[PDB]
CSV table of C-alpha atoms in Angstrom, one decimal:
chain,number,residue,atom,x,y,z
A,1,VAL,CA,0.0,0.0,0.0
A,2,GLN,CA,2.3,2.6,1.6
A,3,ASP,CA,1.6,2.2,5.3
A,4,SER,CA,3.8,-0.8,4.7
A,5,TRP,CA,6.5,1.6,3.4
A,6,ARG,CA,7.2,3.1,6.9
A,7,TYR,CA,10.5,2.1,8.7
A,8,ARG,CA,12.5,3.7,11.3
A,9,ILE,CA,15.8,3.2,13.2
A,10,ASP,CA,15.6,1.7,16.7
A,11,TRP,CA,18.4,1.0,19.2
A,12,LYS,CA,18.1,-2.4,20.8
A,13,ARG,CA,19.5,-2.7,24.4
A,14,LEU,CA,22.1,-5.5,24.5
A,15,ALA,CA,22.2,-8.1,27.4
A,16,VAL,CA,25.2,-7.7,29.8
A,17,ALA,CA,27.9,-10.3,28.7
A,18,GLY,CA,38.8,-9.5,26.4
A,19,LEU,CA,41.2,-7.6,24.2
A,20,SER,CA,44.7,-8.7,23.1
A,21,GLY,CA,47.6,-7.8,20.8
A,22,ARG,CA,48.6,-4.6,19.0
A,23,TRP,CA,45.9,-1.9,18.5
A,24,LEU,CA,46.7,1.1,16.5
A,25,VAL,CA,44.9,4.2,17.7
A,26,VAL,CA,44.7,6.9,15.1
A,27,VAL,CA,44.3,10.3,16.7
A,28,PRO,CA,44.2,13.7,15.0
A,29,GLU,CA,47.5,15.5,15.7
A,30,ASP,CA,46.7,18.5,17.8
A,31,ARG,CA,44.3,16.2,19.8
A,32,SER,CA,46.9,14.0,21.7
A,33,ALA,CA,45.6,15.1,25.1
A,34,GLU,CA,42.4,13.1,24.5
A,35,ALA,CA,43.2,9.5,23.6
A,36,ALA,CA,45.2,9.3,26.8
A,37,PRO,CA,42.2,7.7,28.5
A,38,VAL,CA,41.3,5.8,25.3
A,39,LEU,CA,44.8,4.0,25.5
A,40,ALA,CA,44.4,3.5,29.2
A,41,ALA,CA,41.0,1.7,28.6
A,42,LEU,CA,42.5,-0.5,25.8
A,43,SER,CA,45.5,-1.3,28.0
A,44,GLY,CA,43.3,-2.0,30.9
A,45,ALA,CA,41.2,-4.1,28.6
A,46,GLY,CA,44.4,-6.1,27.8
A,47,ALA,CA,45.4,-4.7,24.4
A,48,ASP,CA,48.9,-3.3,23.6
A,49,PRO,CA,47.8,0.2,22.3
A,50,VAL,CA,50.0,2.2,20.0
A,51,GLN,CA,49.0,5.9,19.3
A,52,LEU,CA,49.5,7.2,15.8
A,53,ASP,CA,49.1,10.9,15.7
A,54,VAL,CA,48.3,12.1,12.2
A,55,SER,CA,47.7,15.5,10.4
A,56,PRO,CA,44.1,15.4,9.4
A,57,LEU,CA,45.0,17.6,6.3
A,58,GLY,CA,47.7,15.1,5.3
A,59,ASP,CA,48.0,13.1,2.1
A,60,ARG,CA,46.8,9.5,1.7
A,61,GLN,CA,50.4,8.4,0.8
A,62,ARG,CA,51.8,10.0,4.0
A,63,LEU,CA,49.2,8.2,6.1
A,64,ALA,CA,49.9,4.8,4.3
A,65,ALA,CA,53.7,5.3,5.0
A,66,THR,CA,52.8,6.0,8.6
A,67,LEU,CA,50.7,2.9,8.8
A,68,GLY,CA,53.2,0.6,6.9
A,69,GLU,CA,55.9,1.8,9.3
A,70,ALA,CA,53.6,1.0,12.3
A,71,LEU,CA,52.7,-2.4,10.8
A,72,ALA,CA,56.4,-3.2,10.1
A,73,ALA,CA,57.1,-2.4,13.8
A,74,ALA,CA,54.4,-4.9,15.0
A,75,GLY,CA,56.0,-7.7,12.9
A,76,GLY,CA,53.5,-7.4,10.0
A,77,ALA,CA,50.3,-7.9,11.9
A,78,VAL,CA,48.1,-6.0,14.2
A,79,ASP,CA,44.9,-6.9,15.9
A,80,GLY,CA,42.7,-3.9,15.3
A,81,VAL,CA,42.6,-0.2,14.3
A,82,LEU,CA,40.6,2.4,16.3
A,83,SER,CA,40.1,5.7,14.5
A,84,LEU,CA,39.5,8.7,16.7
A,85,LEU,CA,39.7,10.9,13.5
A,86,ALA,CA,36.0,11.9,13.6
A,87,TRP,CA,36.7,13.9,16.8
A,88,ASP,CA,38.3,16.5,14.7
A,89,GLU,CA,35.4,18.9,14.1
A,90,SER,CA,37.6,21.7,12.7
A,91,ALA,CA,36.8,23.4,9.5
A,92,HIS,CA,38.6,22.3,6.3
A,93,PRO,CA,40.3,25.1,4.3
A,94,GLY,CA,38.8,24.1,1.0
A,95,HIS,CA,35.2,23.6,2.1
A,96,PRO,CA,32.2,25.0,4.0
A,97,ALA,CA,30.6,23.4,7.0
A,98,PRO,CA,29.4,20.8,7.9
A,99,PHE,CA,32.2,18.9,6.2
A,100,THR,CA,35.0,18.7,8.9
A,101,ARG,CA,38.7,17.7,8.7
A,102,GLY,CA,37.7,14.5,10.6
A,103,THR,CA,35.3,13.7,7.8
A,104,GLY,CA,38.1,13.9,5.1
A,105,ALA,CA,40.7,12.3,7.4
A,106,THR,CA,38.4,9.2,8.1
A,107,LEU,CA,37.9,8.7,4.4
A,108,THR,CA,41.7,9.0,3.9
A,109,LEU,CA,42.3,6.4,6.6
A,110,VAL,CA,40.0,3.8,5.0
A,111,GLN,CA,42.0,4.2,1.7
A,112,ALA,CA,45.4,4.3,3.3
A,113,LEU,CA,44.9,1.2,5.4
A,114,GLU,CA,44.5,-0.8,2.2
A,115,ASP,CA,47.6,1.0,0.7
A,116,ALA,CA,49.6,-0.1,3.7
A,117,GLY,CA,48.2,-3.7,3.6
A,118,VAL,CA,46.7,-3.6,7.2
A,119,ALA,CA,44.3,-6.4,7.2
A,120,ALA,CA,43.0,-5.9,10.8
A,121,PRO,CA,39.4,-4.6,11.3
A,122,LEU,CA,39.0,-0.8,11.4
A,123,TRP,CA,36.7,0.6,14.2
A,124,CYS,CA,35.6,4.3,14.0
A,125,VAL,CA,34.6,5.9,17.2
A,126,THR,CA,32.3,9.0,17.4
A,127,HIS,CA,30.7,10.9,20.3
A,128,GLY,CA,27.2,12.6,20.2
A,129,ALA,CA,26.6,11.3,16.6
A,130,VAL,CA,23.4,9.2,17.1
A,131,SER,CA,20.3,9.5,19.3
A,132,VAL,CA,19.2,6.1,20.9
A,133,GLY,CA,15.9,7.6,21.9
A,134,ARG,CA,13.8,10.1,23.7
A,135,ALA,CA,16.1,11.9,26.0
A,136,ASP,CA,19.3,11.4,24.1
A,137,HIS,CA,20.1,14.3,21.7
A,138,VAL,CA,22.5,14.3,18.8
A,139,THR,CA,25.3,16.9,19.8
A,140,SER,CA,27.5,16.3,16.7
A,141,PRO,CA,25.5,15.9,13.5
A,142,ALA,CA,28.8,16.2,11.7
A,143,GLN,CA,30.1,13.0,13.2
A,144,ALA,CA,27.0,11.1,12.0
A,145,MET,CA,28.5,11.6,8.4
A,146,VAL,CA,31.2,9.1,9.4
A,147,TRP,CA,28.4,6.7,10.3
A,148,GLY,CA,26.8,7.2,6.9
A,149,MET,CA,30.0,6.7,5.0
A,150,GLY,CA,31.1,3.8,7.4
A,151,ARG,CA,28.1,1.6,6.6
A,152,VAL,CA,29.1,2.0,3.0
A,153,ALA,CA,32.8,1.0,3.8
A,154,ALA,CA,31.4,-2.1,5.5
A,155,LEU,CA,29.7,-3.2,2.2
A,156,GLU,CA,32.7,-2.2,0.1
A,157,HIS,CA,35.5,-3.5,2.3
A,158,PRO,CA,33.8,-6.2,4.3
A,159,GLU,CA,36.9,-8.2,5.3
A,160,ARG,CA,38.6,-5.1,6.9
A,161,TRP,CA,35.7,-3.2,8.4
A,162,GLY,CA,35.2,-3.6,12.2
A,163,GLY,CA,32.4,-1.2,13.0
A,164,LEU,CA,31.1,2.0,14.4
A,165,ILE,CA,30.8,3.0,18.0
A,166,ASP,CA,29.3,6.1,19.4
A,167,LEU,CA,30.4,7.3,22.9
A,168,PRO,CA,28.1,9.5,25.0
A,169,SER,CA,28.4,13.2,23.8
A,170,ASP,CA,31.0,13.8,26.6
A,171,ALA,CA,32.0,10.2,27.5
A,172,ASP,CA,33.6,8.9,30.7
A,173,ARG,CA,35.7,5.9,31.8
A,174,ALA,CA,32.9,3.4,32.3
A,175,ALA,CA,31.8,4.3,28.7
A,176,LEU,CA,35.4,3.6,27.3
A,177,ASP,CA,35.4,0.3,29.2
A,178,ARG,CA,32.2,-0.7,27.4
A,179,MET,CA,33.8,0.4,24.1
A,180,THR,CA,36.5,-2.2,24.6
A,181,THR,CA,33.8,-5.0,25.1
A,182,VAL,CA,32.6,-4.1,21.6
A,183,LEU,CA,36.1,-4.1,20.1
A,184,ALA,CA,36.7,-7.5,21.5
A,185,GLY,CA,34.2,-8.9,18.9
A,186,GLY,CA,32.0,-10.7,21.4
A,187,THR,CA,28.8,-8.6,20.7
A,188,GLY,CA,28.2,-9.8,17.2
A,189,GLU,CA,27.2,-6.2,16.5
A,190,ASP,CA,28.9,-3.5,14.2
A,191,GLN,CA,26.8,-0.4,14.8
A,192,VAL,CA,26.8,0.2,18.5
A,193,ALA,CA,25.9,3.0,20.8
A,194,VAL,CA,27.6,3.2,24.4
A,195,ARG,CA,25.3,4.8,26.9
A,196,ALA,CA,25.1,5.1,30.7
A,197,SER,CA,22.6,2.2,30.5
A,198,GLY,CA,25.0,-0.2,28.7
A,199,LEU,CA,25.3,-1.2,24.9
A,200,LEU,CA,22.7,-0.5,22.2
A,201,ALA,CA,22.7,-1.9,18.7
A,202,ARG,CA,21.2,-0.4,15.5
A,203,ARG,CA,18.1,-1.9,13.9
A,204,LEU,CA,15.8,-1.0,11.0
A,205,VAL,CA,12.3,-1.9,12.1
A,206,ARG,CA,8.7,-1.3,10.8
A,207,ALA,CA,7.2,1.9,12.0
A,208,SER,CA,3.6,1.1,11.3
A,209,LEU,CA,0.6,3.3,12.5
A,210,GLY,CA,-5.3,7.9,13.9
A,211,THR,CA,-4.9,11.5,15.2
A,212,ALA,CA,-3.1,13.6,12.7
A,213,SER,CA,-2.4,17.3,13.1
A,214,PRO,CA,-1.8,20.1,10.5
A,215,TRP,CA,1.8,20.7,9.6
A,216,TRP,CA,1.2,23.9,7.4
A,217,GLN,CA,-1.2,26.8,7.7
A,218,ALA,CA,-3.3,27.9,4.6
A,219,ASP,CA,-2.5,31.6,5.4
A,220,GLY,CA,1.3,30.8,5.8
A,221,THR,CA,3.9,30.5,3.0
A,222,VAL,CA,5.4,27.1,2.4
A,223,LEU,CA,8.8,27.1,0.8
A,224,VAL,CA,9.8,24.4,-1.6
A,225,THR,CA,13.3,24.1,-2.7
A,226,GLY,CA,14.9,22.7,-5.8
A,227,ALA,CA,11.6,23.4,-7.6
A,228,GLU,CA,13.1,22.9,-11.0
A,229,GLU,CA,13.0,19.1,-10.2
A,230,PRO,CA,9.9,16.8,-10.7
A,231,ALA,CA,9.7,15.7,-7.0
A,232,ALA,CA,9.6,19.3,-5.9
A,233,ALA,CA,7.0,20.4,-8.5
A,234,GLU,CA,4.7,17.5,-7.5
A,235,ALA,CA,5.1,18.5,-3.8
A,236,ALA,CA,4.1,22.0,-4.6
A,237,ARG,CA,1.1,20.8,-6.8
A,238,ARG,CA,0.0,18.7,-3.9
A,239,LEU,CA,0.3,21.5,-1.4
A,240,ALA,CA,-1.9,23.7,-3.6
A,241,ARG,CA,-4.4,20.9,-4.1
A,242,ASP,CA,-4.6,20.3,-0.4
A,243,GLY,CA,-5.4,24.0,0.4
A,244,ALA,CA,-2.0,25.9,0.8
A,245,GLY,CA,-2.7,29.5,-0.2
A,246,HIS,CA,1.0,30.7,-0.6
A,247,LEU,CA,4.0,29.1,-2.1
A,248,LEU,CA,7.6,30.2,-2.4
A,249,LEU,CA,9.5,28.1,-4.9
A,250,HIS,CA,13.3,28.2,-4.9
A,251,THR,CA,15.3,26.9,-7.9
A,252,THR,CA,19.0,26.0,-8.0
A,253,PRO,CA,21.0,28.4,-10.2
A,254,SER,CA,21.3,27.3,-13.9
A,255,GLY,CA,10.2,25.2,-12.6
A,256,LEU,CA,9.1,28.6,-13.9
A,257,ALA,CA,6.1,30.5,-15.5
A,258,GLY,CA,4.1,27.4,-16.6
A,259,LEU,CA,4.2,26.0,-13.0
A,260,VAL,CA,3.2,29.3,-11.4
A,261,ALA,CA,0.2,29.7,-13.7
A,262,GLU,CA,-0.8,26.1,-12.9
A,263,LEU,CA,-0.5,26.5,-9.2
A,264,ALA,CA,-2.7,29.6,-9.4
A,265,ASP,CA,-5.4,27.4,-11.0
A,266,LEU,CA,-4.9,24.9,-8.2
A,267,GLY,CA,-5.5,27.6,-5.7
A,268,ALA,CA,-2.1,29.0,-4.5
A,269,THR,CA,-0.2,32.1,-5.3
A,270,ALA,CA,3.3,31.1,-5.9
A,271,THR,CA,6.4,33.1,-6.6
A,272,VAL,CA,9.8,31.9,-7.8
A,273,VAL,CA,13.2,32.9,-6.5
A,274,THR,CA,16.7,31.7,-7.6
A,275,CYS,CA,19.9,31.7,-5.5
A,276,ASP,CA,22.6,29.4,-4.0
A,277,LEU,CA,21.2,28.2,-0.7
A,278,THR,CA,24.8,26.9,0.2
A,279,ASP,CA,25.5,30.6,0.6
A,280,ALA,CA,24.1,31.6,4.0
A,281,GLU,CA,23.6,35.3,3.0
A,282,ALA,CA,21.4,34.2,0.1
A,283,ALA,CA,19.4,31.8,2.3
A,284,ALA,CA,19.0,34.7,4.8
A,285,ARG,CA,17.7,36.9,1.9
A,286,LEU,CA,15.3,34.2,0.8
A,287,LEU,CA,13.7,34.0,4.3
A,288,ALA,CA,13.6,37.7,4.9
A,289,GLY,CA,11.6,38.0,1.6
A,290,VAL,CA,8.6,36.1,3.0
A,291,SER,CA,5.7,38.4,3.5
A,292,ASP,CA,4.7,39.2,7.1
A,293,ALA,CA,1.0,38.8,6.2
A,294,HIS,CA,1.9,35.2,5.3
A,295,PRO,CA,4.7,34.1,7.5
A,296,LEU,CA,6.8,31.0,6.9
A,297,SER,CA,4.7,27.9,7.9
A,298,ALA,CA,6.8,25.1,6.5
A,299,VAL,CA,9.9,24.3,4.4
A,300,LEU,CA,10.2,21.3,2.0
A,301,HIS,CA,13.9,21.0,1.3
A,302,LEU,CA,14.9,18.9,-1.7
A,303,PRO,CA,18.7,19.1,-2.2
A,304,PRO,CA,20.1,18.3,-5.6
A,305,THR,CA,20.9,14.8,-6.6
A,306,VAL,CA,24.7,14.1,-6.6
A,307,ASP,CA,26.9,11.4,-8.3
A,308,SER,CA,28.4,8.6,-6.3
A,309,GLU,CA,31.9,6.8,-6.5
A,310,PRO,CA,33.3,3.8,-4.7
A,311,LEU,CA,35.3,4.9,-1.6
A,312,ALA,CA,38.6,3.6,-3.0
A,313,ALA,CA,38.1,5.8,-6.1
A,314,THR,CA,37.1,9.1,-4.5
A,315,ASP,CA,39.1,11.6,-2.5
A,316,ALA,CA,38.5,14.1,0.4
A,317,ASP,CA,37.6,17.0,-1.9
A,318,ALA,CA,35.0,15.1,-4.0
A,319,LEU,CA,33.5,13.7,-0.7
A,320,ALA,CA,33.4,17.3,0.7
A,321,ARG,CA,31.6,18.6,-2.4
A,322,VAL,CA,28.9,16.0,-2.1
A,323,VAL,CA,28.4,16.8,1.6
A,324,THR,CA,28.1,20.4,0.6
A,325,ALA,CA,25.4,19.8,-2.1
A,326,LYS,CA,23.3,17.6,0.3
A,327,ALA,CA,23.8,19.3,3.7
A,328,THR,CA,25.1,22.9,3.7
A,329,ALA,CA,21.9,24.6,2.7
A,330,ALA,CA,20.0,22.5,5.4
A,331,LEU,CA,22.7,23.6,7.8
A,332,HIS,CA,22.0,27.2,7.1
A,333,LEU,CA,18.2,26.9,7.0
A,334,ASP,CA,18.2,25.2,10.4
A,335,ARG,CA,20.5,27.9,11.8
A,336,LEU,CA,18.7,31.0,10.4
A,337,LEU,CA,15.3,29.6,11.4
A,338,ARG,CA,16.6,28.8,14.8
A,339,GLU,CA,18.0,32.4,15.0
A,340,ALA,CA,14.5,33.8,14.0
A,341,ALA,CA,12.9,32.1,17.1
A,342,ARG,CA,4.9,29.3,15.8
A,343,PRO,CA,7.9,27.2,14.7
A,344,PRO,CA,7.9,26.5,11.0
A,345,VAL,CA,8.3,22.8,10.1
A,346,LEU,CA,11.6,22.1,8.3
A,347,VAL,CA,11.4,18.9,6.3
A,348,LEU,CA,14.6,17.4,4.9
A,349,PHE,CA,14.6,15.0,2.0
A,350,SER,CA,17.2,12.3,2.9
A,351,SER,CA,17.8,8.9,1.4
A,352,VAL,CA,17.9,5.2,2.3
A,353,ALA,CA,21.8,5.6,1.4
A,354,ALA,CA,22.0,7.2,4.9
A,355,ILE,CA,19.9,4.5,6.6
A,356,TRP,CA,21.4,1.2,5.4
A,357,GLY,CA,24.0,2.2,2.8
A,358,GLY,CA,24.7,0.9,-0.7
A,359,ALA,CA,27.9,0.2,-2.6
A,360,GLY,CA,29.0,3.3,-4.5
A,361,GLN,CA,27.0,5.6,-2.3
A,362,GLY,CA,29.6,6.6,0.3
A,363,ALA,CA,29.6,10.4,-0.2
A,364,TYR,CA,25.8,10.4,-0.8
A,365,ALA,CA,25.4,8.6,2.6
A,366,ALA,CA,27.7,11.0,4.5
A,367,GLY,CA,25.8,14.1,3.4
A,368,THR,CA,22.3,12.7,3.8
A,369,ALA,CA,23.3,11.2,7.2
A,370,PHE,CA,23.9,14.8,8.3
A,371,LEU,CA,20.1,15.5,7.5
A,372,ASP,CA,19.0,12.6,9.6
A,373,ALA,CA,21.2,13.8,12.4
A,374,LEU,CA,19.9,17.4,12.4
A,375,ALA,CA,16.5,15.7,13.1
A,376,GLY,CA,17.8,14.1,16.2
A,377,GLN,CA,19.2,17.4,17.8
A,378,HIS,CA,17.3,19.2,20.6
A,379,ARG,CA,15.6,22.4,19.5
A,380,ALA,CA,14.4,24.5,22.4
A,381,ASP,CA,12.3,26.8,20.2
A,382,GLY,CA,12.0,25.2,16.8
A,383,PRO,CA,12.2,24.8,13.9
A,384,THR,CA,10.7,21.3,14.3
A,385,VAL,CA,12.9,19.3,11.9
A,386,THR,CA,11.8,16.1,10.2
A,387,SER,CA,14.1,14.1,8.1
A,388,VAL,CA,12.5,11.6,5.7
A,389,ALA,CA,14.9,9.0,4.2
A,390,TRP,CA,13.4,8.0,0.8
A,391,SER,CA,14.0,5.2,-1.5
A,392,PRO,CA,14.2,6.5,-5.1
A,393,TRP,CA,11.1,7.9,-6.8
A,394,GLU,CA,9.8,7.0,-10.2
A,395,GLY,CA,11.3,8.9,-13.1
A,396,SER,CA,14.5,9.7,-11.1
A,397,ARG,CA,17.9,9.1,-12.6
A,398,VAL,CA,18.9,5.9,-10.6
A,399,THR,CA,15.7,4.3,-11.6
A,400,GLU,CA,17.2,4.4,-15.3
A,401,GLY,CA,17.0,0.7,-15.9
A,402,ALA,CA,20.9,0.2,-15.8
A,403,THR,CA,21.5,1.0,-12.1
A,404,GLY,CA,17.6,1.0,-12.1
A,405,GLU,CA,17.4,-2.7,-13.0
A,406,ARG,CA,20.0,-3.4,-10.3
A,407,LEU,CA,17.8,-1.6,-7.7
A,408,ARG,CA,14.7,-3.5,-8.9
A,409,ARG,CA,16.5,-6.8,-8.7
A,410,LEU,CA,17.5,-5.9,-5.1
A,411,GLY,CA,13.7,-5.5,-4.6
A,412,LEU,CA,13.5,-1.7,-4.5
A,413,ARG,CA,10.4,-0.6,-6.5
A,414,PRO,CA,10.5,3.1,-7.5
A,415,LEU,CA,8.0,5.2,-5.6
A,416,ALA,CA,5.0,6.6,-7.4
A,417,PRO,CA,5.1,10.4,-6.7
A,418,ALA,CA,1.5,10.6,-5.6
A,419,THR,CA,1.8,7.7,-3.2
A,420,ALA,CA,5.1,9.0,-1.8
A,421,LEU,CA,3.6,12.4,-1.2
A,422,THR,CA,0.7,10.9,0.7
A,423,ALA,CA,3.2,8.9,2.8
A,424,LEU,CA,5.0,12.2,3.5
A,425,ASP,CA,1.8,13.9,4.6
A,426,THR,CA,0.9,10.9,6.9
A,427,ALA,CA,4.3,11.1,8.5
A,428,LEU,CA,4.4,14.9,9.0
A,429,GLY,CA,0.8,14.8,10.2
A,430,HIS,CA,1.6,12.1,12.7
A,431,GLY,CA,4.5,14.1,14.3
A,432,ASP,CA,7.4,12.0,12.8
A,433,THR,CA,10.8,13.5,13.2
A,434,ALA,CA,12.9,10.7,11.5
A,435,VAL,CA,11.1,8.0,9.3
A,436,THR,CA,12.2,5.9,6.3
A,437,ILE,CA,9.7,5.6,3.4
A,438,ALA,CA,10.7,2.8,1.0
A,439,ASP,CA,8.9,0.1,-1.0
A,440,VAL,CA,11.1,-2.9,-0.4
A,441,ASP,CA,10.6,-6.6,-1.2
A,442,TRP,CA,12.7,-7.9,1.7
A,443,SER,CA,12.9,-11.5,0.3
A,444,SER,CA,15.2,-9.9,-2.5
A,445,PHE,CA,16.7,-7.2,-0.5
A,446,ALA,CA,18.0,-8.9,2.6
A,447,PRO,CA,19.9,-11.6,0.8
A,448,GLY,CA,21.3,-9.0,-1.7
A,449,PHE,CA,22.3,-6.7,1.2
A,450,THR,CA,24.2,-9.5,3.1
A,451,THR,CA,25.8,-11.3,0.2
A,452,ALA,CA,29.2,-9.7,0.9
A,453,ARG,CA,28.9,-8.5,4.5
A,454,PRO,CA,27.0,-10.3,7.3
A,455,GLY,CA,25.2,-7.9,9.6
A,456,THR,CA,22.4,-7.5,12.0
A,457,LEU,CA,20.7,-4.3,11.0
A,458,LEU,CA,17.7,-6.3,9.6
A,459,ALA,CA,17.6,-8.9,12.5
A,460,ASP,CA,14.4,-7.5,14.0
A,461,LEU,CA,12.4,-7.0,10.8
A,462,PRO,CA,10.4,-10.2,10.0
A,463,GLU,CA,10.2,-10.2,6.2
A,464,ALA,CA,14.0,-9.6,6.1
A,465,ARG,CA,15.1,-11.9,8.9
A,466,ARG,CA,13.1,-14.8,7.5
A,467,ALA,CA,15.1,-14.4,4.2
A,468,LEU,CA,18.2,-14.8,6.3
A,469,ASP,CA,20.3,-17.4,8.3
A,470,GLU,CA,22.7,-17.0,11.3
């Protein structure tokens, strides 16, 4: 139907239950201070930890030399690799926020490990990157981009990917002790949160549903971005049909007159504006232009599609560019709307690439995971952010039969635009903050997803688990 298209991410509490050999701990250079208690925990856990301070700006070849040297020193083998690189939240010189030096550096490390021939599993540790539930806010949406790319690294380099572990936003000694139980490989899990309560593991489950509430006001203006694209046009047609009186349509610098005349027939007065929403000044201009007789009621943010590459084949600047196209405008919209604080609703269009990952989608998953993380941050006054992670819509490029036929054979059926927009309305109307909408035949998907890499993300979803074995 489409009520069977709703999924969400849940964090399953794990039952209460050592480490050995050489562990390389990769720390960003000017961050040596922290790590001290990281090596103490690993040592105390019974590992022999070696710190490897790197320049996050550094070349892949420099890092591979550094790793090969460290691997030569251990006799040619090491038991694991623990990256603290995500902790580097500093700005990168070539690139706007939210891309950080830690984002680039982590990618560089995945590549450089293979250049140095380190066969040991890589574990990437974040803090404040995921929300396990109600009271647990995301404090570093930028570190969630490592989770997005990391799930993709798991599928692309399954023999050398250990996992992802998120420490409490601040993170104390009892938390680093539980970290070491995860590194020991006893949990069977590879996407783990460490909380005051114990360990939690990531699961995609059904989010099935009768009291809606309005998420836009007829007298307010609703902004739709990337309106030159078919998804965004249909959304605006739907809002007019449903009774929205005022539409502001943004288009990405090179639809237009036809669409405006059409929406007037459907009942809305729409105006069209063009500017680079990755430029905060222009985003600020856009918002200030909304009439005070019709204040901003809701924003539908549809960032441009981007091209993907395997992780081995991309580089830190390409990754950074894709993060910018998917996430920087949303960063600014969230900030300026926060700074103007009824909360408008800010609806981000994310992607199943950020939820479960796909080979070739590394960069796309990083940027789109930043959207899903914005939705998990506390906002004292608004805007109320919803991130919806979509599977591809009919007509869209990836449904092209080449890669399109691949998706279909993995059991992903392109979404009809009408049905998808009704699913969007049900979610916003039901108060959803983070939901996945996707039409998935799990009997094809779950075997195709686990063919190279075992995992447990779908363990608690019946149609998928029944298509699997332990």
